[PDB]
């Protein structure tokens, strides 16, 4: 039968790809980085404590200037903080308080946010009038929005709960491209440094690397057990880290087309909420549901340090574009910026 | 600090004052979840209270304000977003009594009542709603009474005693729905039968909210 033939062909293709991945795995990252100098105990302190949110903080993003920060909470207010002087810059009242993601434009002119309303609202921060107003409302997604990322001042890529992603032109408000192929809900997005490629993790325990221009899925990566919640590109751009409900992080390389390293410990039995690298990529910072964040040696997978200063689970993590400091937001409605010391 | 820095600090203080005022204003509103299946006669309930994505309905009673969220149109895995409603005062569940003999559209043998029971079990026995109360509404009273007059309740409940009467069948349905509460010590179910009188339903909802608030306060005192 045609259906049986197609199923057999799909199974054969799966076997071929797994065999190729096994063959190309001539070695492992652990052996190569065995002799690398351990990073050592990484110690960080909360330099600033941003307060004012009266509900769970669900998302945050760092500006390109590495000084302005944007935070979104279920209270219904989107707050722009001045990290250096812990001074509030803007307080945008959100039409819908059920927001789970937020984004900050690379130029800082626009801020995008969304959630259970299934609409991505874009706010212009540099209008002639001294107030922030909605510039566009991207609607069309059949499910709740999970992540938002600005490609430029006019193009924005958003992932929703309908198991599809979409590239929108802000000026027209029409879906320029639609990305399909995920059999489960999409939970996170991560733009490549080149801005041409991106990778999306889904609840089906898999990540997919797509092409922005061609609107097609270039690669797929598996290895997680239950559900991927966070994803982030390695600074070089040829690799990305994924955090999952399995309480373990996994590093994948696009060129290798398979998992590279796995980060896990017997003391953690809770899922990963957020993931991010340092500027050099040596440190992999992952937020955990156990009221604290962890730092892993991206090369040796050793637990360098713990950032435990939140009374509730760490919901969002971010590293400044320059890597000077790392900000963490938790459900207790407090945002804390951590930095190291000599 | 420079003059511009002082002005920025003053602006931040004004923003903080506005945020505090907005939080104080919002703290006075009761938040209620709304859930159901098969439309659960939900449109009638929402329009009684009032008189894509989440739909928020605000209605003010004699002395209290209520915010109700209809997230039944989300149509996505509840695991990834249900936790957002951890702070809701109560969860209103709506069930159509006529679903006992109706077969789910997505299936061919499972009854809609079984799906409603499964959804009720999932929502009630949830780690995010262990201490949250549930207000259960049974909408299609008249249509259920008409159906049971000809179709026996055993079609959906083989274990049922087989008594073909309205009162006994309704009591059996209520008992079965309440039995799903595996955390009776921490939460309670306020079952009610919907009626054409809107004021009766609104009064019942207000009374349930008041009882929940009183019990929560008493538990704060430690008596519970």
């Amino acid at each position: 039968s045609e259906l049986d033939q197609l199923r057999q062909e799909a199974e054969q293709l799966k076997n071929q790809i797994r065999d190729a991945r096994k063959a190309c795995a001539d070695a492992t990252l652990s052996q190569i980085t065995n002799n690398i100098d351990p990073v050592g105990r990484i110690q960080m302190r909360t330099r600033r404590t941003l307060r004012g949110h009266l509900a769970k903080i669900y998302a945050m993003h760092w500006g390109t200037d590495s000084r302005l920060l944007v935070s979104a909470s279920q209270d219904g207010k989107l707050i722009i903080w001045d990290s250096y002087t812990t001074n509030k810059v803007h307080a945008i009242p959100l039409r819908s308080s059920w927001v789970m993601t937020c984004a900050y434009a690379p130029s800082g002119n626009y801020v995008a946010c969304g959630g259970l309303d299934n609409i991505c609202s874009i706010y212009n921060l540099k209008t002639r009038e001294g107030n922030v107003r909605v510039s566009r409302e991207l609607a069309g997604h059949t499910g709740y929005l999970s992540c938002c990322r600005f490609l430029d001042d006019n193009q924005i890529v958003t992932s929703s709960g309908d198991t599809t992603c979409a590239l929108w032109d802000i000026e027209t408000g029409q879906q320029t491209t639609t990305f399909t192929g995920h059999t489960g809900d999409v939970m996170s997005l991560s733009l490549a440094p080149d801005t041409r490629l991106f990778v999306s993790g889904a609840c089906d325990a898999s990540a997919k690397l797509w092409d922005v221009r061609e609107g097609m899925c270039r690669q797929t990566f598996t290895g997680h057990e239950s559900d991927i919640n966070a994803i982030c590109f390695f600074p070089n751009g040829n690799a990305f880290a994924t955090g999952s409900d399995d309480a373990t992080c996994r590093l994948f390389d696009l060129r290798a087309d398979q998992e590279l390293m796995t980060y896990s410990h017997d003391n953690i039995i809770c899922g990963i909420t957020s993931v991010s690298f340092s500027k050099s990529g040596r440190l992999l910072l992952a937020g955990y549901d156990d009221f604290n964040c962890n730092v892993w040696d991206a090369l040796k997978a050793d637990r360098a340090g713990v950032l435990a200063g939140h009374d509730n689970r760490v919901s969002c993590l971010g590293v400044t574009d320059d890597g000077m400091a790392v900000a963490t937001g938790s459900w207790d409605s407090f945002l804390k910026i951590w930095n190291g010391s000599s | 600090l420079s003059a511009e820095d002082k002005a920025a600090v003053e602006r931040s203080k004004m923003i903080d004052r506005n945020l505090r005022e907005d939080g104080e204003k919002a703290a006075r509103e009761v938040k209620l979840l709304l859930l159901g299946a098969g439309e659960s006669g939900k449109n009638t309930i929402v329009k009684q209270m009032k008189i894509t994505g989440i739909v928020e309905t605000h209605f003010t009673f004699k002395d209290l304000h209520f915010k109700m969220f209809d997230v039944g149109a989300q149509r996505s895995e509840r695991k990834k977003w249900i936790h957002c409603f951890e702070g809701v005062t109560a969860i209103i569940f709506c069930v159509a009594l006529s679903d006992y003999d109706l077969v789910l559209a997505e299936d061919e043998e499972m009854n809609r009542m079984h799906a409603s029971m499964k959804l009720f079990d999932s929502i009630c026995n949830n780690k995010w709603f262990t201490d949250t109360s549930i207000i259960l509404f049974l909408n299609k009273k008249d249509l259920f009474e008409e159906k049971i007059k000809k179709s026996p309740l055993t079609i959906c409940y083989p274990e049922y005693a087989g008594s073909n009467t309205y009162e006994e069948a309704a009591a059996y349905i209520q008992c079965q729905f309440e039995d799903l509460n595996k955390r009776k010590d921490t939460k309670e179910i306020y079952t009610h039968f919907t009626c054409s009188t809107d004021t009766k339903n609104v009064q019942f909802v207000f009374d349930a909210v008041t009882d929940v608030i009183i019990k929560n306060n008493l538990k704060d005192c430690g008596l519970f």
Epitope: V89, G108, E129 | -
Partner: single-chain antibody, 233 residues
Framework: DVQLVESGGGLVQPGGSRKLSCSAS????????MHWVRQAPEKGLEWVAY????????YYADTVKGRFTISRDDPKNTLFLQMTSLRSEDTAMYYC??????????????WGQGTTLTVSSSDIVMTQATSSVPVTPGESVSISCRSS???????????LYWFLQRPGQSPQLLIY???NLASGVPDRFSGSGSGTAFTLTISRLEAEDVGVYYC?????????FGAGTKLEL
């Protein structure tokens, strides 16, 4: 669009009093602090009074302190300056200026038309190189200015503002903080400076660029405007 309309003025007996009223439209008045700037006949700009958003802070010039009082009415989007004991030197054209303060903000971005007022019958000093210089289309010019006290704050921001006044028109902001071009201004202008010596350069002069250029310091009150430089075609 953003607009400020001032009202009140005319002839006043010496020692009299009157309330100047400015109406703001096209923008959130409550979110903007307000300044009053008076220009005497054939003279430079001079700061008068300032009221912050919400009326939380008020400042006056020593020549204005006590005699004139500033207030604002947010719901009607109005600004009031009640002047009493009007001296003969108070005759001038008064402009209302909006200002917004936050990281990356550009205060003094909009200036009102202002109104005329005439009578019957310890701070940073800013100076400019020359009163006037010749100009032709397509040429490059460099106006220079200096301040008694360094404007480079410890935070790293140099509080210098450049304003251009057209003949028969109110001044407009060109550059704020000595390094940020004002929104809508053509890219021809470019400001630079160090500590106490500042210069505004024009890559290629245009026929419209002719006008009176003023320099302002925002490091500390009172705000002092240097003598204007007349750029003549």
């Amino acid at each position: 669009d953003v607009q400020l309309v001032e009202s009140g003025g005319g002839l006043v007996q010496p020692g009299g009093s009157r309330k100047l009223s400015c109406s703001a439209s096209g923008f959130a008045f409550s979110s903007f602090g307000m300044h009053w700037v008076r220009q005497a006949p054939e003279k430079g700009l001079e700061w008068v009074a300032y009221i912050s958003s919400g009326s939380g802070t008020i400042y006056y010039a020593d020549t204005v302190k006590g005699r004139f009082t500033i207030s604002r009415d947010d719901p009607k989007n109005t600004l009031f300056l009640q002047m009493t004991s009007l001296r003969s030197e108070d005759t001038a054209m008064y402009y209302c200026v909006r200002s917004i303060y936050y990281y990356g903000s550009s205060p003094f971005d909009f200036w009102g038309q202002g109104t005329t007022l005439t009578v019957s019958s310890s701070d940073i000093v800013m100076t400019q190189a020359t009163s006037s210089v010749p100009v032709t289309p397509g040429e490059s010019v460099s106006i220079s200015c200096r301040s008694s006290k360094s404007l480079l704050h410890s935070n790293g921001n140099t509080y210098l503002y450049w304003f251009l006044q057209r003949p028969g028109q109110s001044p407009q902001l060109l550059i704020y903080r000595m390094s940020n071009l004002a929104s809508g201004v053509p890219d021809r202008f470019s400001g630079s400076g160090s500590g106490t010596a500042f210069t505004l350069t024009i890559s290629r002069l245009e026929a419209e660029d002719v006008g009176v250029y003023y320099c302002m310091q925002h490091l500390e009150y009172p705000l002092t405007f240097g003598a204007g430089t007349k750029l003549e075609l």
